[PDB]
Amino acid sequence: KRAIYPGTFDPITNGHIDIVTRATQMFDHVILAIAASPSKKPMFTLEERVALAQQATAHLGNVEVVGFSDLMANFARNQHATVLIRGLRAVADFEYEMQLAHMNRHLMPELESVFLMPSKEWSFISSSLVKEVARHQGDVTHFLPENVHQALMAKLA
Template identity: 35%
Template sequence: MKIALFPGSFDPVTKAHVDIVKRAVNLFDKLYIGIGVNSSKQGFLSIAQREQMLRAVFEMEPRIHIIAYEGLTVDFCKSIDANYMVRGIRTVSDFEYEKAIAQMNHVMAPDIESIFIVSKPGYSSISSTIVREVLKHGGDVSQFIPKEALAYL
């Protein structure tokens, strides 16, 4: 069985995330969306809100499982028997950052492959950070967020 993890903060989930998930899910038998918990960071949304939001967005896809985790992502992959890690790439700087992480992960867990999916051009400027800034200043984020997620903001 081919199992993959798509890790991230998803704070909040964006249409760019959804695009990566929809393109990745058909490559695997099971795709976990892992919400990484960083205890040193205060999130915009709670972990529980992010889980609920992601479940609402992907409720119609039985191969997608939503779960929060702490610690090293490669250790979490091992705990769920995932041999693949999916990462979205929007820009050249994303690639350089993700490449460095993938290489470190490969040293720690050579049996876990990193799979990079390049974002569609229309989504390359969308990030959770930018969405949070727009929200902070009272802007309309409906064009950047899946409609199922709007209720959680």
């Protein structure tokens, strides 16, 4: 059983690590798929986000980190994944995820959308909040893998 976990991951946080870790305990192979996501004008390049997520997930033996610009339902099919994973935190995410799941079902009905809820520890954070706290000299070491915190400090310096 193969699952894909697609997202912008700009940068990957402990909330994303929590989700991908739970996914590795349920599936034989997990593809952590990083979208180029130019409409979000990311802080980190796609190559930087892939290297960061690779170093942050290296302790999980069945995780493969890749980048993509394709329609996520096509990319799942190309990874031979029958499950597409998304984390669920808040009501805003839930409404967006319902639209995304129904569209993905229309495009690839054999691809199952599965939702996981992160630890309470990460239920009130996002990459966007973390970046803004760090932009204002707020400490975010608790929310990010060590290598990601280093890269975020380096990018803002």
